[PDB]
Every structure is written in structure tokens, then in C-alpha cells.
Amino acid sequence: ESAQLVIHKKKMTSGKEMSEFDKYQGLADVTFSIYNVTSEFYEQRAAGASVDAAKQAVQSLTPGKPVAQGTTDANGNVTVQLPKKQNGKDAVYTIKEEPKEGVVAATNMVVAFPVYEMYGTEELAVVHIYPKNVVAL
Ligand code: NA
Ligand code: NA
């Protein structure tokens, strides 16, 4: 009933691990805070938003206390576990990078369960993400 979310923080110059990103240095000691936006997603949906629009909307929301937080290790990685469901519904989370001196923070990202490899037929129990700031890139 929980999935692992593996967050890879890269200094940038599918849902599965992507070897392409190994060209970039991993950044240690970066904290990510993960917020439950499940209710907010379903509200957007009930108001007629598409799945994509609903995700885009809740991307800017960080309601309440983070359900999880993790700080990257020496290689730039951290795993957190997240419930696949919240209040009986397929869960949606907003992932926020905490500000850190000398680091360009990623834009907030949304992860909506279940996750399929981008879509394949097998649900992922391990989801890999690579938060980035495209405007900065
Ligand atoms: Na998804
Ligand atoms: Na990044």
C-alpha cells in the first residue's frame, strides 16, 4: 500500500531510473518536502479539470504538514515512502525542493498514483524522479 519515491537531485547543465541523468553531478544535503494534494486534485477533477490540468493546478499547492521529507545523500539521492492511497483514493503529491545556498531549486513536481512507465501496463512500486528548473537550464 506504499510506494518508494526515489528523488535524484542533479546539477543540470519515465518514472524509472534514467541512466542519461548520470552525466550530471548529484547534489548532497538537499531537502525535499512532499505534500498530500489528493483532496485538492479530486476537487479540481470534480470541477471539470483534465488530469493534466488538475496536476498543473495542484503543483503550486503545499497544504498542511509534509507527509514526508528527505535529504539527499552524498550521491544526491533520497528515498521516501508514500501511501498509494489517501482517504481511499489514488494519491497525489506535490514535491517541493527546500531552498539551499548555491543550489538552483527545482520547480515543484507532482506524482499521481498509480504510476506506470511513460504508459505501460505494469504499475511501479518504485518511482524515480529528477526534479529540475527548466527556466534556469
Ligand atoms: Na501518474
Ligand atoms: Na535540478
DSSP H or E segment with residue 52: helix 51-58
How far apart CA 7 and CA 135 sit, in angstroms, is 20
Residue 44 domain-assigned (yes or no): yes
Ligand lying nearest the CA atom of residue 93: 1
Contacts of residue 115, Cβ cutoff 8 Å, sequence gap at least 6: 3, 15, 123, 124, 127
Residue 53 domain-assigned (yes or no): yes
Give residue 32's domain range.
2-129
91 CA from centroid of ligand 2 (Å): 24
In the numeric block, the cell 552524498 is attached to 74
**What is the pairing mode between strands 2-8 and 109-112?**
unpaired
Q: Are 45 and 83 in contact (CB under 8 A)?
A: no
24 CA from centroid of ligand 2 (Å): 9
Q: Are 2 and 126 in contact (CB under 8 A)?
A: no
Ligand lying nearest the CA atom of residue 100: 2
Resolution (Å units): 1.8
- The experimental method behind these coordinates is X-ray
> Which residues face 57 on adjacent strands?
none
85 CA from centroid of ligand 2 (Å): 28
Residue 135 domain-assigned (yes or no): no
Which DSSP string do the residues of 56-91 spell out, in sequence order?
Answer: HHHTT---SS-SEEEE--TTSEEEEEEESEETTEE-
How far apart CA 55 and CA 44 sit, in angstroms, is 9
Q: What's the length of the chain?
A: 137
Residue 93 domain-assigned (yes or no): yes
Residue 61 domain-assigned (yes or no): yes
Ligand lying nearest the CA atom of residue 95: 2
56 CA from centroid of ligand 1 (Å): 13
87 CB neighbour count, 10 Å cutoff: 10
Query: Angle at which helices 51-58 and 38-46 pack, to 10 degrees?
Result: 130
| Domain CATH number, residue 34 | 2.60.40.10
Ligand lying nearest the CA atom of residue 72: 2
88 CA from centroid of ligand 2 (Å): 33
Residue 136 domain-assigned (yes or no): no
> Among 78, 69, 83, which residue's Cα sits nearest to residue 128?
78
Residue 134 domain-assigned (yes or no): no
Ligand lying nearest the CA atom of residue 5: 1
55 CA from centroid of ligand 2 (Å): 20
3-state secondary structure of 22: helix
Residue 137 domain-assigned (yes or no): no
Which DSSP string do the residues of 104-136 spell out, in sequence order?
Answer: PPPPPEEEESSPB----SSBPSEEEE----TTT
Number of domains in the chain: 1
